[PDB]
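This section describes the prediction task in plain terms. A model, or a person checking by hand, is given the sequence of a single protein chain and must write out its three-dimensional structure as a string of tokens. No templates, partner chains or ligands are provided. The sample shown here is typical of the held-out split.
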Amino acid sequence: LAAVSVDCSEYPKPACTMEYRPLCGSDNKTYGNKCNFCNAVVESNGTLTLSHFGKC
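The expected answer:
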């Protein structure tokens, strides 16, 4: 069960911009921004969850 989440409703997306607004995944990766994160949630078939906001 997810404690926290982001809005990944409109994903997948072909590109992201490069702003550095970090998110820490449950896989212990820091994702540079929400769009990289929500791209990875989709790619992982929803196995990826958000651990917390900010860099791991």
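For orientation: The domain at 1-56 is CATH 3.30.60.30 (Wheat Germ Agglutinin (Isolectin 2); domain 1).
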